[PDB]
């Protein structure tokens, strides 16, 4: 019965590839082919964060536009005032091995997470003056790769043992679990409707979820090699994914297929991290060979380079007004550019 | 939070006294620490400041030269020493902490004081208004220079005192609300004319209300404005 | 002419030095406390070619009679004494610092920072200006009204006791921890009783100590000579402290170049002119 | 600049005094990455998701990393800077060492740990001799290399054992050897080792190989190589 | 065994789903993208006057 079942499957797949095919009229290179370019951009740094002593890991720009938060090996998580560089709070962390960070929407409390497989939550804003543990969400078999923060009361995780959760804050329990990649999961995108989100593994391919139903709408699947970063459009219809195979892909949902590849030839290495501008015309990419990279979302051509770290370029976050580009690498230093 | 304030009585003019402000209930070492003085029938007059980690010490003038601070944080103890207590030291002492950040609300917590018997101007014109429950309320602080900075802040702080209490935060920074007051207090003004309005007034809400200023110091403190049923 | 075969030992000099510098400065990997130490030899080495050697060449052109201001002269002479002793015990602090990072590695990888190095440059400097400030005190005099030259060089009657015991604190006491540390520490690497790589070090520690050991010995052994013999003819050993003393002076040209080109970093930096 | 921006700076650098003290007190420990396939024993070489372990001689700390499932290429990008990675292999069998031997491949030609050295630990010798005099076993079933393999005459053996289970214990010792000296150059080395099951010494062993490891960062940076 | 029958239970799932063409979903993303460039500050350098930064 197994033949059966695996036939009726190719059968299936080839019927979804027929159905995608027949959708493909015309490319988004030719529609925007008389399109004036955006030119060439050039940023500078502003303000050079340090007082970090190892690698950072990730970071996470605050709903106000003022302050981030920042992680790093040495066991650290410290809150930047952006404007003057001055230290809110360091908060020192049970374990050192630290693989991503997120901020509330309210601003009143922090995630994070790694190997210890546990999502830890701090409180910012209490009486006697001092940061708090809050709580520690356990449950996962593999480390955490991202956490994004829903509301004050519920956030989602990602982990390596191939599947994603969402936790009530309050009672402190999984509500709904996503178990549907083969490999490890590396990374997760959220919506502005807050109603769907993406995630990004390592079995080179991408899947959309439902947070109140819970089961998979689409599946993508373009890429040769595993994914690191993801991201999501501000119109909420489409995202992007950039892979180790040094190249990116934007991705729609209507369609259900895959729409711009950017690569060139003189890149060879991985990307880190990916980022879209506030009105969607600018894709921020970071690469191993220590620079980040600017692509014209809508014509597939480079723009700009950003070349201020001397080691390899691991977080990347815009502002939300789109007044500045936050940009930490593993030579403890994160800057700002405009 | 609790914050215990020691030492009083009869002093002969001349003499020393020390006085001390005891803490108990939150990080003494991450606050820094003020020392405020009230007169018999008189408003707040502020006295002394030490900073955390002991960097900075600010006096005032009045006191300046024979009034020294101090603090132990293993102890979490603050000390205040007096010398030479002339006829016009006769007050309450209270003692008042404070933090500095990004979006903090300092002169949140006042002891409740112990008492000892031996530039910029801020005005307030009304000194006792009648009022009813149910109405609504407005009262009026004016300020000599401007309060607003180049950073955008203005630096207006408002508090009430009940019969018999200490006072309390209301309103920092002009617009912002304390924890714990409820959403029928609210504050607006610009440059050198400042209000604070409430709204469905009731019982609770009589005392006298004080706008400070945080600009510069001396800190300065205003004459107070009485509301009785 | 002369002038134009020997200004070819003072253009090399600045050259090395500025370039050592501009490696330093401009390429982050080479940025550590043992590194920080270099930049202090490398800055003694520079003002020797920039102030002290065209100085020697005018009073060779001209007369051998200072042609120079004469208030000058007596500020030369501890310029020159400074610069020399602090280029001595810089390469003497190298000598013992390499001998504890290879007899004890562990705790040697554990104490560097940046304030031993502030600790170690102030030191040198410190000994450097105690041995050279007794010459401005007792300054050189003269005789005639209206000094045409007054022969600006260190005289046996007059300075006799600075020649003697400003020699042992200058080079004999650094050259006495310079043969135990040599002979101890080739000792150590010799712990393995193509080419090893404690066999390229022990080579490296060879070039460096026998060219220190044949630019400022022929000097030095010339002074003592001068000062404790009072038979030997003083005429012909006046003819050999003016040739030995420039073999010193080309030292600065040299130490740029055998302490930086051994590592391959410092080779690209050079490359592309920095 | 107001009053209350000057206590933030202030307050802002003592937390940098504060973060820098703690970076100088937390730098005085060396860091090991103890990992193993399976069945090596590798719990018990020292006797005194992550497991830690601490350990002290002569005075120097060391902190070791015990992770613990088949891709660990994900994970291992952290430990880019510990002193050394200890691998632990059992030496008794013979079904699973060409596992063992792809492992050893697979982590020696990372892409990550081109600057780290490897510590080997070959455990279970006392099983590897029994079995060898008991004549049960062949190697040639799985290596046909043995039959013709060179005696190690150069070499000197330890006092007291049978030649048999010095040509295998060095037949397996070269195996790895020539696997770690195919690639990596000079840019990182291999200590071979031999434990039994109840070893009293082996930290003497990990401290001496990591003294070599420093002693020659500090030749290579002291601008003598 | 069996996962093969939720496999194909959730490639039946997702078949049978609505889809527009690609040119109708390029081009409501260029006009967004050109309806809010004015309010994008990384595309147009905004005047030193009004960066925060
Ligand atoms: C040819 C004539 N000149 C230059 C005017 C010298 O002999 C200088 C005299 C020196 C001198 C004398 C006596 C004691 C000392 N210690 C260290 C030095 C020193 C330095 C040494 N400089 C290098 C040369």
């Given at each position: 019965e197994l033949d059966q079942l695996r036939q009726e499957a190719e059968q299936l797949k080839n019927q979804i590839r027929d159905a995608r095919k027949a959708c493909?009229?015309?490319?988004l290179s030719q529609i925007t082919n008389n399109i004036d370019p955006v030119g060439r951009i050039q940023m500078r740094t502003r303000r050079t964060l340090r007082g970090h002593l190892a690698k950072i890991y990730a970071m996470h720009w605050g709903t106000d536009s003022r302050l981030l938060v920042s992680a790093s090996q040495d066991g650290k998580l410290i809150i930047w005032d952006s404007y003057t560089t001055n230290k809110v709070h360091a908060i020192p962390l049970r374990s050192s091995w630290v693989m991503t960070c997120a901020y509330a929407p309210s601003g009143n409390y922090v995630a994070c997470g790694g190997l210890d497989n546990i999502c830890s939550i701090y409180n910012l804003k209490t009486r006697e003056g001092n940061v708090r543990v809050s709580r520690e969400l356990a449950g996962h078999t593999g480390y955490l790769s991202c956490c994004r923060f829903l509301d004050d009361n519920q956030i989602v995780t990602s982990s390596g043992d191939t599947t994603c959760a969402l936790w009530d804050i309050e009672t402190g329990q999984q509500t709904t679990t996503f178990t549907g990649h083969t490999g490890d999961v590396m990374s997760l995108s959220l919506a502005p409707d807050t109603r769907l989100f993406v995630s990004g593994a390592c079995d080179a391919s991408a899947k959309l979820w439902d947070v109140?139903?819970?089961?998979?709408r689409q599946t993508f699947t373009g890429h040769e090699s595993d994914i690191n970063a993801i991201c999501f459009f501000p119109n909420g219809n489409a995202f992007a994914t950039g892979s180790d195979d040094a190249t990116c892909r934007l991705f729609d949902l209507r369609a259900d297929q895959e729409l711009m590849t950017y690569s060139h030839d003189n890149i060879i290495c991985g990307i880190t991290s990916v980022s879209f501008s506030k009105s969607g015309r600018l894709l921020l990419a970071g690469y191993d060979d220590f620079n980040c990279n600017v692509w014209d979302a809508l014509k597939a051509d480079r723009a700009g380079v950003l070349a201020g770290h001397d080691n390899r370029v691991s977080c990347l976050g815009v502002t939300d007004d789109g007044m500045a580009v936050a940009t930490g690498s593993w030579d403890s230093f994160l800057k700002i550019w405009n | 939070v609790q914050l215990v304030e020691s030492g009083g009585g009869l002093v002969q003019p001349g003499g020393s006294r020390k006085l001390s402000c005891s803490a108990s209930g939150f990080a003494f070492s991450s606050f820094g620490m003020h020392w405020v003085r009230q007169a018999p029938e008189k408003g707040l007059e502020w006295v002394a400041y030490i900073s955390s980690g002991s960097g900075t010490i600010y006096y005032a003038d009045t006191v300046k030269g024979r009034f020294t601070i101090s603090r132990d944080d293993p102890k979490n103890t603050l000390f205040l020493q007096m010398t030479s207590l002339r006829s016009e030291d006769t007050a309450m002492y209270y003692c008042v902490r404070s933090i500095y950040y990004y979006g903090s609300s300092p002169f949140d917590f006042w002891g409740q004081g112990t008492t000892l018997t031996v530039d910029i101007v801020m005005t307030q014109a009304t000194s006792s208004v009648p009022v009813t429950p149910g109405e609504s309320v407005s009262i009026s602080c004016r300020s000599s220079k401007s309060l607003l900075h180049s950073n955008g802040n203005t630096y207006l702080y408002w508090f009430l005192q009940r019969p018999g209490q200490s006072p309390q935060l209301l309103?920092?920074?002009?617009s912002n609300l304390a924890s714990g007051v409820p959403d029928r207090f609210s504050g607006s003004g610009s440059g050198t004319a400042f209000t604070l309005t409430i709204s469905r007034l009731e019982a609770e809400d009589v005392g006298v209300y004080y706008c400070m200023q945080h600009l510069e110091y001396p800190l300065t403190f205003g004459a107070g404005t009485k509301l009785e049923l | 002419w002369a002038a134009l075969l020997i200004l070819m030992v003072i253009i090399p000099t600045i050259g090395g030095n500025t370039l050592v510098i501009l490696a330093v400065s401009l390429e982050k990997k080479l940025q550590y406390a043992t590194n920080y130490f270099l930049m202090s030899l490398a800055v003694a080495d520079l003002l020797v070619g920039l102030f002290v050697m065209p100085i020697a060449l005018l009073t060779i052109m001209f007369?051998?009679?200072?042609?120079?201001?004469?208030?000058?002269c007596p500020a030369w002479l501890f310029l020159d004494v400074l610069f020399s002793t602090a280029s001595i015990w810089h390469l003497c602090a190298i000598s013992v610092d390499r001998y504890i990072a290879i007899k004890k590695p562990i705790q040697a990888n554990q104490y560097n920072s940046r304030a031993t190095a502030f600790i170690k440059i102030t030191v040198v400097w410190l000994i450097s200006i105690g041995i050279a400030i007794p010459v401005p005190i007792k300054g050189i005099e003269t005789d005639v009204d209206n000094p045409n030259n007054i022969t600006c060089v260190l005289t046996k009657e007059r300075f006799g006791d600075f020649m003697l015991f400003g020699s042992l604190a200058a080079f004999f006491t650094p050259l006495a921890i310079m043969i135990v540390t040599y002979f101890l520490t080739i000792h150590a690497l010799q712990k393995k009783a193509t080419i090893s790589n404690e066999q390229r070090a022990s080579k490296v520690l060879g070039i460096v100590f026998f060219l220190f050991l044949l630019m400022w010995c022929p000097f030095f052994i010339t002074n003592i000579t001068l000062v404790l013999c009072?038979?030997?003819?003083?005429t012909t050993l006046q003819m050999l402290l003016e040739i030995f003393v420039w073999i010193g002076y080309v030292s600065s040209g040299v130490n740029p170049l055998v302490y930086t080109l051994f590592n391959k970093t410092f080779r690209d930096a050079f490359g592309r002119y920095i | 600049v107001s009053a209350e921006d000057k206590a933030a700076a202030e307050r802002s650098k003592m937390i940098d005094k504060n973060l820098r003290e703690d970076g100088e007190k937390a730098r005085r420990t060396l860091r090991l990455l103890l990992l193993g396939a399976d069945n090596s024993g590798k719990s018990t070489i020292v006797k005194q998701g992550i497991f830690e372990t601490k350990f002290q001689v002569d005075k120097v700390n060391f902190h070791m990393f015990d992770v613990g499932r088949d891709e660990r290429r994900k994970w291992i990008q952290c430990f880019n800077d510990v002193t050394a990675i200890i691998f632990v292999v059992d030496s008794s069998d013979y079904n699973r060492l060409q596992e063992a031997l792809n492992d050893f491949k697979s982590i020696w030609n990372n892409r990550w740990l081109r600057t780290i050295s490897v510590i080997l630990f070959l455990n279970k010798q006392d099983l590897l001799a029994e079995k060898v005099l008991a004549?049960?076993?062949?190697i040639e079933d799985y290596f046909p290399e043995f039959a013709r393999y060179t005696t190690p005459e150069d070499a000197t053996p330890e006092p007291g054992e049978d030649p048999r289970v010095t040509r295998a214990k060095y037949f397996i010792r070269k195996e790895f050897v020539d696997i770690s000296t195919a690639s990596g150059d000079g840019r990182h080395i291999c200590y071979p080792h031999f434990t039994c099951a109840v070893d009293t010494e082996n930290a003497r062993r990990i401290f001496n190989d990591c003294k070599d490891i420093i002693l020659q960062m500090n030749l290579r940076e002291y601008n003598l190589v | 065994i069996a996962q093969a029958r939720k496999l194909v239970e959730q490639l039946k799932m997702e078949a049978n789903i609505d889809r527009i063409k690609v040119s109708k979903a390029a081009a409501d993303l260029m006009a967004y993208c050109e309806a809010h460039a004015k309010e994008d500050p990384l595309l147009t350098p905004v005047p030193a006057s009004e960066n925060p930064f």
């Open positions: 493909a009229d015309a490319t109140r139903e819970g089961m998979c | 309103i920092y920074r002009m | 007369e051998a009679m200072w042609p120079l201001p004469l208030v000058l009072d038979s030997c003819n003083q | 004549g049960k076993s062949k | -």
